[PDB]
Every structure is written in C-alpha cells, then in structure tokens.
Amino acid sequence: MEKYNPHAIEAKWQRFWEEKGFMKAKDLPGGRGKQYVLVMFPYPSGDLHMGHLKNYTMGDVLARFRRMQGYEVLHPMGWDAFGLPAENAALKFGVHPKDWTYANIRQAKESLRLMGILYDWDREVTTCEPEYYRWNQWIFLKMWEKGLAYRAKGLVNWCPKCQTVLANEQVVEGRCWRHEDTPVEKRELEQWYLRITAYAERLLKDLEGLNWPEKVKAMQRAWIGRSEGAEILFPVEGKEVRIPVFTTRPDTLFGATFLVLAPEHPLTLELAAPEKREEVLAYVEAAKRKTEIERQAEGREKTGVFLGAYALNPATGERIPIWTADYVLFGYGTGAIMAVPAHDQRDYEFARKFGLPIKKVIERPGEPLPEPLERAYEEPGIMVNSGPFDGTESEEGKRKVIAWLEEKGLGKGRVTYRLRDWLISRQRYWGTPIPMVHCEACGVVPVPEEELPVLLPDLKDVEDIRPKGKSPLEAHPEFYETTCPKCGGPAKRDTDTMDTFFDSSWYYLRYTDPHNDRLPFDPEKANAWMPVDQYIGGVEHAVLHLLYSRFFTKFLHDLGMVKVEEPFQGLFTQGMVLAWTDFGPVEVEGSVVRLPEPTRIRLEIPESALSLEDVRKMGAELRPHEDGTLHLWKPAVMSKSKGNGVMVGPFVKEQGADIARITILFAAPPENEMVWTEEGVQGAWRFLNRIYRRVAEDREALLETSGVFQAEALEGKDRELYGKLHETLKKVTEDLEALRFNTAIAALMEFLNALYEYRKDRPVTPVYRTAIRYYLQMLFPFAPHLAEELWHWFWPDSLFEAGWPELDEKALEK
Ligand SMILES: CC(C)C[C@H](N)C(=O)NS(=O)(=O)OC[C@H]1O[C@@H](n2cnc3c(N)ncnc32)[C@H](O)[C@@H]1O
Ligand SMILES: [Zn+2]
Ligand SMILES: [Zn+2]
C-alpha cells in the first residue's frame, strides 16, 4: 500500500485554489456576515522564515475556517516597503532600495504560496509606490489643517548608524529599534511632529473594552502615563504677582522650601532686588550663551543666584526664598518650580549646596526616613507635617490637595501624560516626501491636494542616497527648487521624509479599497469591512504600530471617514518561533561551566561562569562537538541576525507544506514561544502518514458505501462513534474560534485514534464514511493539501465548497 507523498500534490492544489479564487473578497460583504482576518504585513528586508510563517499560517487557518463557515472573508497581504527596514537592508549590501525591495517581495510571495497560504492578492499594497504614499501625503495635509501636524525645534533622539532622528517609541532601552547595539544620541533640530498627545485621554480610556492581551494594554497605559498634577500660585511678598508653578507632586506642597525660576523666566530679572540685579543679569546672560544640549546636561555642578525676593507658601503660609538656577528649564511647566529637597533628588542636591531648608512631608512606609536625610525620598508614602492631610497616602493626597487648592482659589488641577508628540520626519531618501513647501516670505506652506503626489526623485546612485547626516534630497535642487503655492515666488520643498510607521498606521484601511485614486479609501467600503475581527502580530509593536494605528483611526473617525474608533477589535500576539543555536565552546569543571569571551559575547550575558543548573534553567544544553570540545546550544529567536532561520523553499522541497504547518501549529499554544525541532517535524509526518493510511486502507470500501444514515437508528460502536464525532467537531470549532490551534490538532489526533479503534470492530459504514467526510473538513484549515487530495478520492467539489460540518447538540447529551 502506498504512503503519503507531499510532492506534486501541494503544487497542484495551490494552483487550483488560486485559479478558483476561493479567497477573493467582495467589495461589499453580502448580508451573511463578514470576517476581517489580518496579519501584520512584513518589511521586505530579507527572506521569510518559519517564524514569519507561524504568524501567517495562523492567519490562513482562521481565514480558511471562517470561509468554510460561510462568512465573506477579507484576508489580505501587502508590503511595508518604505522606511528604515527596507533601506537599511538594501544599503548593507550596497543595493538600490527599489531593486532590493521588489526582489524581496517576489521571494516572499513564493514562500507564502508554497506554504498553501491564500490571500486576496487583488488587494495587495506596496507602500513605496506613489499609488499608496500619495495618500500618506493626503492624510498628512488633513492633520496639518486640523492642528495635528507641526514643525518645532528642540532636542531629539538620533542614531549615528541610521543617520537620522528617531521617534521616542523607536528607542528601546536607550538603543535604536533597528540597531540594538547602538546607543541613541541627542541633537537639536527642527522637525515635524504629529500631535498624538491630543488623543492621549481617548487612547487610554478606549483600551478598557478592547479584546486585547492584558500585557499589551498594560504597556500602552504605562507608555501614555496619565499623571495627576497641579498649577499652584505663590504670592510674592510685597508684589501683586502670584507666581504660577506646575508640579506633578502637589502632595509635597507643605515641603516646598523655596522656588526656582528658569533664567529666562520674565520674573527672574523683574523680581531681582536692586543690589542683586547685576549678578542676576550676568547669570541670565551666561545661561543663554549655552546650547540646549549644554543646559540639558547632567553631571554639571549646581549653580544659581538668590533673587533677593520671597514668596509665600500657600499651604504653610510661610516665607520662602526665590532663586533662579540653570537646572530649571523654562520649557518645563511654567518655567518655575517649587523645590522640595526632601522628596526630589535634584532639589536635594541644590538645597544641600546652597544651605536651603529640607523638610519632610512624605514618610516612608515601614522604617521611617532618618534624620538627617542623606538623600531625597521620591517614592509614595504617608503625608506628614502637612496639616489636615496628615495620614493620607501620597497618591490619594495629590487629589485631596488639588481639591483643596481649587476650593480655596490657590491653584488648579492639571493632568499631564508621559506620552510625547510623535516625531515623524526623517533625514532619509527611501520614504514618503512631506507635502510642504518653505517660502521665504510666506513661511511654511502646504502643497495643494490636487498636486499630490509629491514624487520621490528617482535617484539611481546608491552612494548618493546613503545617509551622511542630512537628507539625501538636500543635494537635489531639481527636486526641492519649486514655487510657493501661496504667493507664487521661489520656494523650497521640504526635504525630509515620513517614517515607515506612518505608512503602516492605516494600511489595513487601504486593503478595503486598494485601487481608489480619489481618496485613501471610500468610507462605505471601509465601514463594511471594519473593524479587523482578528489581528495577529508580534508584541514588539505594543507602543509602536499598535499605538500609532489607534491614533490614525481615531483621527480618520473624527474626519468622518471611519465609523469605528478602534481599528482592531481583536488582537492576538503570537509567541516567537525559536531555533536551537550553537553559541560556541565551553569548558566544564565540576558544577561550573567556563565561558570563553567569544561564547559569552554571542550569548550576550555578563557571566563568564555558569553552573550546570544555570545552563539548564536558561534552556541550554552542552553538546559534544567534532572539534573535540563541548559547545553550548540554546533556543534563540529565529531571525537573520542569529543565522538560525529555517527558510520555506528548502524545507518544503525536502519535506512539505502541510508538514511545516502541523509542526508549527501543534508545537504549543500560539501565544507561547515554540522551538522548531526535528522531533516536531517527525511528529507532523507521523500524523499525516496516519491520516493517509486510514483513508487509503478503506478507500475501496468507502467508494461502495453511501454516507446517508439515521442517527437515532445507530447502535453500539456506531452510536459511540457518532457521539465522538460531534464531541470532536464542537472542540475543534471552539478551539479555532479562540485560536487554540494546537489543542484543535490534538482533538483531531484523538479522534483519528477513535477511527482506528472503531475499525477494529466495525466495517466501513455510512456513519463511518460521514466521519471521514467531517474529518477532512475539520482538517482543511490545518493541512489543506492533504485534506483536498483525499477529499477528491470520494467527492466532486473542493473543500471550500463543502462548508463547515453542522454540530448535532443532541449527540453531545450523555
Ligand atoms: C504592521 C507592521 C508595522 C509590521 C512590520 N512591517 C513588521 O513587524 N514586520 S516584520 O519584521 O517582517 O514581521 C512580520 C511579522 O512576523 C512576526 N515574526 C517575525 N519573526 C518571528 C518569529 N521568529 N516568530 C514569530 N513571529 C515572528 C512579527 O512579530 C510580525 O508579526
Ligand atoms: Zn539605527
Ligand atoms: Zn510664498
């Protein structure tokens, strides 16, 4: 008897499914129900591996399942082809970005097609094409008109490797999101920002309902960081003015022993005593000579000048000195702060140096703070020496003080967020050009909507587009030299481009109307497919793409183009696929493993010595090598950098697509990480071989049998099989809906065993034929090629036309 052979049959069914267009999505979902199944589109910066395929196979499983149930399914694929990812990869190998991108796209398509993944390719989008980015420019103009896009000068994050500024979200642990080994630096530049802080409250509040993993919600809440602050008024002794001071710690008001004004604050010179005017003016002048960076410095000695003026602390009614000092920036709050040395380390050091009072008003839980205080206590505690507030917990105390201040007209509550506006401009060539013009007379002028797109100059010299500090477009007068759309005189086009995350913040909407050349998309089409019912992608995008996208959707909603305010109704973050990786030789002596420098560095750990227990605990193992030594192996995230990627092409050629699909889907719960292993591959083979063998063994008998029968007339093992069949259907259906793919496969393995057990006692019967029929249908989402192959041995149409088996509730009773 022949055995399962993946060769040839997979290519046959892949072409069949494509020709039939089973996964083509309707422009507008017929009244039967729709399912928008989306996977995060890839950066075409390299070859796809089984890691990417876990994410994309998960999407295909759900898409096939929903399509079989009768839903109109939108399951699209596209290319996040602009920005740093694509250009950094192309430039590393001295290749032109446009050539590199399309060659990579061609390869990615093959990898997806070879795995039996089906998308509605008619909705494909490539962000680096004018047909797409012209709409990025369109949206940019709308934000400009609505006060959400602006130009400002200030300190920004910069990566010397990318040779461009980076947004706050693109800085991970002080390192570049692309160059994890390169520390980000600071610079002073005038850039473009998107006022995402204008939606901070809605971004925070709208998280509550969301069917997203709590871990992602928590990361976004922490990133936004809503804070309870206050503006407090301090009356100046003998003067009319009451100095407004902003603080994030109103709970420490009773401990404010002095005020500090930024050198540039108008009141610094105005309030200076006559005898102090000379020293104050000199200090203010010296401060201005410094650069933003210089004053934004860290370890510089504390300096300052007493203005010779006093203010009254509104809470204690006590007199406190007013000083001006370099460590206070005018841009922070109101440019004036209340110093609380006991609870602010910066204030502590200044107080200690200039002999200013230090008063404790927040007590530390457990062991009380010592006297004298050797350093500030900045954590929450219990209010003390704070009049009627004594005994109140710090956090709640903030609210109480604010309520008191407002009631007495001494100040007002002021909410702030840690979230900062989004820096979108980049000094790179491969990106969307900013649709703005700089006129010497008019200032910054927007490009007319009708003139879009503002095409990227076709630079062919690779050495030319390479980033050296300024935007490559700054060396092309043929591009920027233009006329002002307002006055008509000579002007200069903006030379910076939009970061890649701009493109990806709305691509899922373009999929609903990929060919519209008048609007980014037609509201009617988008509102029919939105919101995304199930989005699948990595958690690494928690405060990047997953945050920016919500902002874009809320903005487009406010424009009246999108009905929903949340783009992804359901989000599932898949665990990473890992691969056993050799980190190098080690030496063992007793319970201690010595790690030579090369090995330690590859492992990226500080230990030069690990115990055998440490090695086990981190999931590593020591394997004898032919070089006569022992090497330390450990599962590492599958990626190019690690050089441990398992590519689709070579694997499916030697093994097969369904084998790879089962290996991935059965390894572990999809939300968890998994390790790609030979044992897993062998397991996939065993399962597929066992399915084929069961059907082949009964092929002849099945052909001469009808699948019609009366359930209530079944007896013995026949009735038992009928019950197990429906128990299995229910389990597999519910598991698929919750993306519990590995357990759905376990249920099919279990039911397959039941089929073998059944046949030991019973012959091929009508109920058995129906069980086989239902089995191939339930198998289709997981191993489609084999399911389609066996299905055709007995039935005419495709599994996509068979629908999803109907559950028999009564069969579940008892
Ligand atoms: C939505 C946009 C911003 C996504 C962005 N283009 C992106 O993250 N692209 S990517 O790096 O090509 O990744 C695409 C998806 O594949 C997932 N992925 C990569 N490597 C993986 C491993 N080893 N295991 C599991 N999943 C992996 C990644 O998380 C993205 O979801
Ligand atoms: Zn970088
Ligand atoms: Zn002008």
Looking at residue 784, which CATH number applies to its domain? 1.10.730.10
| Pairwise CA distance, residues 493 & 481, whole Å | 7
- Residue 78 sits in the same domain as residue 218: yes
Looking at the domain assignment, is residue 12 inside a domain? no
The tokens of 702 are what?
């099945």
- Residue 688 sits in the same domain as residue 787: yes
**Which pairing describes strands 164-166 and 242-247: parallel, antiparallel, or unpaired?**
unpaired
Nearest Cα to 73, choosing from 89, 59, 83, 56?
A: 59
- Residue 583 sits in the same domain as residue 562: no
- Residue 767 sits in the same domain as residue 716: yes
- Residue 572 sits in the same domain as residue 596: no
Under 8 Å CB-to-CB from 109, ≥6 apart: which residues? none
- Residue 785 sits in the same domain as residue 667: yes
The total number of structural domains in the chain stands at 4
- Residue 391 sits in the same domain as residue 427: no
CA of 477 to the centre of ligand 2 (A): 27
3-class secondary-structure state, position 284: helix
Query: What are φ and ψ of residue 192, in 5° steps?
Result: -100, 140
Asked if residue 422 lies in contact with residue 229, where contact means CB atoms within 8 angstroms, the answer is no
Looking at the domain assignment, is residue 371 inside a domain? yes
Nearest Cα to 620, choosing from 589, 586, 590, 580?
A: 580
Nearest Cα to 80, choosing from 114, 38, 115?
A: 38
The tally of CA atoms less than 13 A away on the side-chain side of residue 481 is 4
Cα angle at 788 between 784 and 793, to 5 degrees? 155
**Domain closes at, from 366, 397, 416:** 416
The tokens of 670 are what?
């999809």
Amino acid code (one letter) for 301? E
| Residue 89 CB less than 6 A away from ligand 1 | no
- Report the nearest atom of ligand 1 relative to the CA of 44: 12
| Pairwise CA distance, residues 475 & 477, whole Å | 6
707-726 exposure pattern, b = at least 16 Cβ within 10 A, e = fewer: bebeeeebeebbebbbbbbb
Asked if residue 661 lies in contact with residue 117, where contact means CB atoms within 8 angstroms, the answer is no
The tokens of 145 are what?
């008109």
| Pairwise CA distance, residues 703 & 564, whole Å | 51
- Residue 241 sits in the same domain as residue 320: yes
Q: What is the Cα 650 distance to its own chain's centre?
A: 30
Cβ-based neighbour number of residue 649 at 10 Å: 13
CATH number of residue 349's parent domain: 3.90.740.10
**Domain closes at, from 615, 646, 677:** 646
Task: Break the chain down into helix, strand, coil percent, rounded to 5.
Answer: 40, 20, 40
In sequence order, what are the beta bridge partners of 321? 310
CATH number of residue 595's parent domain: 2.30.210.10
- Residue 398 sits in the same domain as residue 439: no
| Pairwise CA distance, residues 398 & 402, whole Å | 6
Asked if residue 373 lies in contact with residue 351, where contact means CB atoms within 8 angstroms, the answer is no
Task: Taking the CA atoms of 502, 505, 507 and 509 in sequence, report the sign of the dihedral they define.
Answer: negative
Amino acid code (one letter) for 626? E
Looking at the domain assignment, is residue 66 inside a domain? yes
**Domain closes at, from 364, 391, 416:** 416
3-class secondary-structure state, position 45: coil
Q: Atom 1 (ligand 1): residue with closest C-alpha?
A: 40
Amino acid code (one letter) for 286? A
What is the domain extent for residue 54? 31-222+417-578+636-646
Task: Taking the CA atoms of 733, 738, 743 and 745 in sequence, report the sign of the dihedral they define.
Answer: positive
Determination technique used: X-ray
- Ligand number nearest to the C-alpha of 44: 1
Looking at the domain assignment, is residue 282 inside a domain? yes
- Residue 216 sits in the same domain as residue 246: no
- Report the nearest atom of ligand 1 relative to the CA of 504: 3
The tokens of 438 are what?
């700089």
Looking at the domain assignment, is residue 100 inside a domain? yes
- Residue 231 sits in the same domain as residue 188: no
| Pairwise CA distance, residues 415 & 468, whole Å | 41
3-class secondary-structure state, position 462: helix
Asked if residue 431 lies in contact with residue 82, where contact means CB atoms within 8 angstroms, the answer is yes
Query: What are φ and ψ of residue 500, in 5° steps?
Result: -60, -30
Provide the greatest CA pair distance for the chain.
Answer: 112
The tally of CA atoms less than 13 A away on the side-chain side of residue 239 is 17
| Pairwise CA distance, residues 812 & 711, whole Å | 12
- Residue 245 sits in the same domain as residue 203: no
| Residue 538 CB less than 6 A away from ligand 1 | yes
Numbers of helices and strands, H then E, in the chain: 28, 32
- Can you point out the beta strands (E) in 271-427? 305-312, 319-324, 336-339, 362-363, 382-383, 411-417, 422-423, 425-426
Looking at the domain assignment, is residue 11 inside a domain? no
Instruction: Name the residues around ion ligand 2, CB cutoff 5 A.
Output: 159, 161-162, 176, 178-179
Looking at the domain assignment, is residue 218 inside a domain? yes
Nearest Cα to 665, choosing from 28, 186, 55?
A: 55
Asked if residue 563 lies in contact with residue 528, where contact means CB atoms within 8 angstroms, the answer is no
Looking at the domain assignment, is residue 713 inside a domain? yes
- Report the nearest atom of ligand 1 relative to the CA of 577: 24
CATH number of residue 493's parent domain: 3.40.50.620
